[PDB]
Design a protein around this nucleic acid. Sequence first.
RNA 1: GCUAGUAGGUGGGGUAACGGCUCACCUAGGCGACGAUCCCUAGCUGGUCUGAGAGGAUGACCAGCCACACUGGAACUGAGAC
RNA 2: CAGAAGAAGCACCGGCUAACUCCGUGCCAGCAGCCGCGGUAAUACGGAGGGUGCAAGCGUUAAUCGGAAUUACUGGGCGUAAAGCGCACGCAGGCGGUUUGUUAAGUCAGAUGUGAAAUCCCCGGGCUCAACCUGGGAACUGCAUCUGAUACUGGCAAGCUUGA
RNA 3: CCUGGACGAAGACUGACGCUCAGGUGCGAAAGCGUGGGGAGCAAACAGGAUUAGAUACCCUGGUAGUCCACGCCGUAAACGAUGUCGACUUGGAGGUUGUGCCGGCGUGGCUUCCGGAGCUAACGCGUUAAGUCGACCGCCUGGGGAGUACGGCCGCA
RNA 4: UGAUUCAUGACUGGGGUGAAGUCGUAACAAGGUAACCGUAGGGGAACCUGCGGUUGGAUC
Lengths: 205, 123, 79, 156, 129
Amino acid sequence: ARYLGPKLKLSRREGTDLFLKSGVRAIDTKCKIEQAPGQHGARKPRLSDYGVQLREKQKVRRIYGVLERQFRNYYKEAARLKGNTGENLLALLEGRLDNVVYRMGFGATRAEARQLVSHKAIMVNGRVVNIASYQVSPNDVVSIREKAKKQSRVKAALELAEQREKPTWLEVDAGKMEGTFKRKPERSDLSADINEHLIVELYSK
Amino acid sequence: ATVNQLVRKPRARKVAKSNVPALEACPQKRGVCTRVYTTTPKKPNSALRKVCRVRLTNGFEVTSYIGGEGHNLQEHSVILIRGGRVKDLPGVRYHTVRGALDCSGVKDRKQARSKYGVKRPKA
Amino acid sequence: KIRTLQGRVVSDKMEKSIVVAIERFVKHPIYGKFIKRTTKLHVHDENNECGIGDVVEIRECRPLSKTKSWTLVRVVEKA
Amino acid sequence: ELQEKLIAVNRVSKTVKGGRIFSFTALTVVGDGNGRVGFGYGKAREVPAAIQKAMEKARRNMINVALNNGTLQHPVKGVHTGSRVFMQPASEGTGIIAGGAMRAVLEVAGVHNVLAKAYGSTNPINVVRATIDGLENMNSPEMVAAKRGKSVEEIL
Amino acid sequence: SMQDPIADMLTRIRNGQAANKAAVTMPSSKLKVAIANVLKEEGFIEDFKVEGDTKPELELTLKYFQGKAVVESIQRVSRPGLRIYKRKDELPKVMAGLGIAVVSTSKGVMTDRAARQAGLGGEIICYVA
RNA sequence: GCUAGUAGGUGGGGUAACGGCUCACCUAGGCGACGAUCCCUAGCUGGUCUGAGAGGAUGACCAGCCACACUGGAACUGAGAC
RNA sequence: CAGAAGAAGCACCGGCUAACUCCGUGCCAGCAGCCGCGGUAAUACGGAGGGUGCAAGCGUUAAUCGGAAUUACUGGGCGUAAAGCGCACGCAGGCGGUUUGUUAAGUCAGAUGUGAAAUCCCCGGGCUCAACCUGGGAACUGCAUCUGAUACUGGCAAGCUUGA
RNA sequence: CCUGGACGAAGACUGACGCUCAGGUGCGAAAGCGUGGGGAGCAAACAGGAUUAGAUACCCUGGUAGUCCACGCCGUAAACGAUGUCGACUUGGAGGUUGUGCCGGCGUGGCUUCCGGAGCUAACGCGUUAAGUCGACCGCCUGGGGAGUACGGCCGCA
RNA sequence: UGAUUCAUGACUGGGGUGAAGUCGUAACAAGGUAACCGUAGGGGAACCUGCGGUUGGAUC
Ligand SMILES: [K+]
Ligand SMILES: [K+]
Ligand SMILES: [K+]
Ligand SMILES: [K+]
Ligand SMILES: [K+]
Ligand SMILES: [K+]
Ligand SMILES: [K+]
Ligand SMILES: [K+]
Ligand SMILES: [K+]
Ligand SMILES: [K+]
Ligand SMILES: [K+]
Ligand SMILES: [K+]
Ligand SMILES: [K+]
Ligand SMILES: [K+]
Ligand SMILES: [K+]
Ligand SMILES: [K+]
Ligand SMILES: [K+]
Ligand SMILES: [K+]
Ligand SMILES: [K+]
Ligand SMILES: [K+]
Ligand SMILES: [K+]
Ligand SMILES: [K+]
Ligand SMILES: [Mg+2]
Ligand SMILES: [Mg+2]
Ligand SMILES: [Mg+2]
Ligand SMILES: [Mg+2]
Ligand SMILES: [Mg+2]
Ligand SMILES: [Mg+2]
Ligand SMILES: [Mg+2]
Ligand SMILES: [Mg+2]
Ligand SMILES: [Mg+2]
Ligand SMILES: [Mg+2]
Ligand SMILES: [Mg+2]
Ligand SMILES: [Mg+2]
Ligand SMILES: [Mg+2]
Ligand SMILES: [Mg+2]
Ligand SMILES: [Mg+2]
Ligand SMILES: [Mg+2]
Ligand SMILES: [Mg+2]
Ligand SMILES: [Mg+2]
Ligand SMILES: [Mg+2]
Ligand SMILES: [Mg+2]
Ligand SMILES: [Mg+2]
Ligand SMILES: [Mg+2]
Ligand SMILES: [Mg+2]
Ligand SMILES: [Mg+2]
Ligand SMILES: [Mg+2]
Ligand SMILES: [Mg+2]
Ligand SMILES: [Mg+2]
Ligand SMILES: [Mg+2]
Ligand SMILES: [Mg+2]
Ligand SMILES: [Mg+2]
Ligand SMILES: [Mg+2]
Ligand SMILES: [Mg+2]
Ligand SMILES: [Mg+2]
Ligand SMILES: [Mg+2]
Ligand SMILES: [Mg+2]
Ligand SMILES: [Mg+2]
Ligand SMILES: [Mg+2]
Ligand SMILES: [Mg+2]
Ligand SMILES: [Mg+2]
Ligand SMILES: [Mg+2]
Ligand SMILES: [Mg+2]
Ligand SMILES: [Mg+2]
């Protein structure tokens, strides 16, 4: 119900950095990033058209840490919601609590932010929520509980967040360790190396 | 066909027959082996394939394949059969379920164990 | 008013009774073509005024025999 | 500038006195992602030479498609030999819902959202021809207004 | 025998355009004239005139744009063997609205756009594109 | 091809009530290629699964209707039961 | 409160189809949905290492629809691929040139009644989330009645001459 | 001798009386069947002579049903244009045959052969006598074999 | 006393599949007698012969 294996083999299969490590080092200083894992990892894959659609879906899944059944349900909702299905699917993944907590800086990675959510250290509008897949609404206040404000990893995570680009749909106060979810991130606020139209087409095969 | 012709005689769907009639739309059926033996396949294959004649609880008398390397089956063994034709064997429409009832799992199997009724090794 | 069907007399050989055929014009549910359908009702004909061919005029009433539950209003056209 | 796609490579054969002589055929499409698309078909003894011949022919045979913001103007039917295709405009985010041979054509031409279906023979050489024949005969409100002697506003 | 004069009218247009004819002529009828009127107001044909008294003759002047026929396709929908009637909310759209459907409503023969504005359904005579 | 209470009529009886519901008499009708009669299968629906749709398949749980209560038959009591 | 402490498997990797090597075997043993694989250099059998896909599940079998425009109403065919009766006449049936009037059955518009609730869909609400529960709408594409419209189709009346 | 249809030219007349057709009915090559005739030539079967490894054949010499007539039955053929009937519309060329108008010359009808344009078609090809563009109605197809077979019905002397 | 349906029956009819033994060589080229259709007769077998029909016959 959660991938618990090596983290860099994932990024090596997808041929890019999945932000699966904190970022204190460079992804090439810990692994052979441009090489797929395994004995035959040095071969040049002739990916079919299905293979290109599949790898794009596995990339987005491996970033946010969602399994297939949950991801397929996100797609069904994205297609049901009005508007562009591909963009609806990214907005739903960015609304997840464990993702929002990470983008706010409270976790070094999405896995760590998930452990903080799971271990009852996060509140939404003033209530403990330990569901990683909880959907954060606009104007909701996410905050760290008092007994967890003293943890040494939450400040180590707050000192790595400014080393990265600040999300403009949030609003963190590193002091009081709480942020506000002002609005859903637009497609422009999200990365451009994610080709979500390949995912939409994969689920019509 | 004109609509007038279709009003009189509408379009007719072709009913399809099952390739596994002895199962009678059941996922499995139990039988008693009446004969266990070998047989040679169609051209262009060559082998001694292991089959058995098995009288089912519904009275049907059919032939069933025994997959895997080696088996413990003999006359009067009680087995469970499932759907599945053997392409190169004339009129063998069913497979024996390894590891069910009197059919033993395959010895020393390490891969695709669940298809041959083999428990997980204690390694 | 009173609901009322209109049809053509196809039989008058019963005492005080007639068979009336009512034609309907309906769209075929699958092929969309408008086709003609017929219903034959047994109708009470006191006075025995109707003949085979007349266009009559009937209404629904209480049961009068095993098969009769309609009764003759008027004759619209005589054969 | 031009997107190129290899759709299919096939090995063909002719018989001679000494036996069979094999060769290869390549079917490709090129396009500028903005309403221009062409297909090329090349034959050679080696695969790479066949592909290069196809790319060369494709670039010389492009036609124009009147697109409407990454989708079609109206539903269209195309036909060539045994292949009959059907294409429809779709809303944004739909993607290209189409088979393999129709997909390559639609993508290099700049169609981003479309619902398509191939009927009859799905031979790639004839499906490509039918697809391009459907796109090439598509009308825009501009040309519909012009031929009918009306303004575009009276059309829509 | 002749059993659909309207389909014969459309076919004469279809075949005349393919033969690059400047005009086509046919025996007239009030329904044919009502259809010719719609074809003219939509700019599909150039003009029409009825000539003759006891045996009127309808003549349609066809138009070509840049050496191509203006009527790209013309197709009978309702036909004697199978009539087609549509309600106002289900009137068809021809070529995503770029073409017309000729509808016979209780207020006369008009296009599908005009029948939608009047809030009427009717018999779908033909598609023109 | 089917049907003699069979189809209709009159009168008596009967039912909470119309009615061949039943009986006597008269008429000779009634149903059927828009499929009667006979044979095989089947509880019906709201719905459910699938499908772009049109359709195709289906009728477990939940709710409406019907039928049955070891097998065949019968009535009694009762506002209501066979 | 205590301590990472109690908690990962199943199928697959020749092509369709995401994922490859070695060793064993040598038309044997065996695999198989299909194409097919196995004859001493097997990415297809069996083990291993590596990999891929799903994950408290994963495979197999059964069964339905789909793909199948392969019963084609939407939406197919019939010279040679399966398919025009050997040729006619003709009842029922289907279809019907042109004009006027009338009718309002088909058709169209509007209204009213009904179309149980649940389900599906939309906007919300409540269980930490979700499943689930729930408020309000929409929908139930139908049927009946009433009042209108009259182009088209039908009926009735009267014609006309181009079909016969 | 009796008799059906088609076509043309001028008019007159009727006033949609039309088109198609499940079931039904009629016609339907050759072979074959029944009864009675006929029988030259031809010729299944059959006989002999050859050929051949054999030769129940091809070849030769013969030869009976049958082929012919009357009446009845049978109802099938690669019964083919392997192309249902009716109507409308859409560039051309060269012929055949049969009408008719006009001044050999110029028109205008019917039927028919070959080529070929657009279009159509998997291709071959079709192409105003469509397999082009449309409408009306009917017949028929739904992988190969089993099989147009079995069983049942109807028809038939078989 | 009938009808219908299921099971079964010495023997018998053809069919399918496998495998290839025996006998020939009917078809595909003008397949060595052009092939095929309907029908009739004959023959161990493919088939042969008569009568009419077709070209979906090569040569000329
Ligand atoms: K083999
Ligand atoms: K009775
Ligand atoms: K009575
Ligand atoms: K249903
Ligand atoms: K009972
Ligand atoms: K070896
Ligand atoms: K159809
Ligand atoms: K007939
Ligand atoms: K002779
Ligand atoms: K010889
Ligand atoms: K003789
Ligand atoms: K005969
Ligand atoms: K012929
Ligand atoms: K002539
Ligand atoms: K002449
Ligand atoms: K017919
Ligand atoms: K006889
Ligand atoms: K028996
Ligand atoms: K021969
Ligand atoms: K031949
Ligand atoms: K013969
Ligand atoms: K013999
Ligand atoms: Mg789960
Ligand atoms: Mg009475
Ligand atoms: Mg196909
Ligand atoms: Mg009653
Ligand atoms: Mg009484
Ligand atoms: Mg039952
Ligand atoms: Mg479908
Ligand atoms: Mg009582
Ligand atoms: Mg692959
Ligand atoms: Mg090896
Ligand atoms: Mg293996
Ligand atoms: Mg279908
Ligand atoms: Mg077909
Ligand atoms: Mg053939
Ligand atoms: Mg054929
Ligand atoms: Mg014919
Ligand atoms: Mg006729
Ligand atoms: Mg009319
Ligand atoms: Mg009305
Ligand atoms: Mg409801
Ligand atoms: Mg909520
Ligand atoms: Mg609700
Ligand atoms: Mg009227
Ligand atoms: Mg009228
Ligand atoms: Mg004869
Ligand atoms: Mg004889
Ligand atoms: Mg005789
Ligand atoms: Mg004689
Ligand atoms: Mg002789
Ligand atoms: Mg025949
Ligand atoms: Mg002939
Ligand atoms: Mg001929
Ligand atoms: Mg024929
Ligand atoms: Mg020609
Ligand atoms: Mg054709
Ligand atoms: Mg027979
Ligand atoms: Mg007979
Ligand atoms: Mg031979
Ligand atoms: Mg020969
Ligand atoms: Mg025969
Ligand atoms: Mg002989
Ligand atoms: Mg001879």
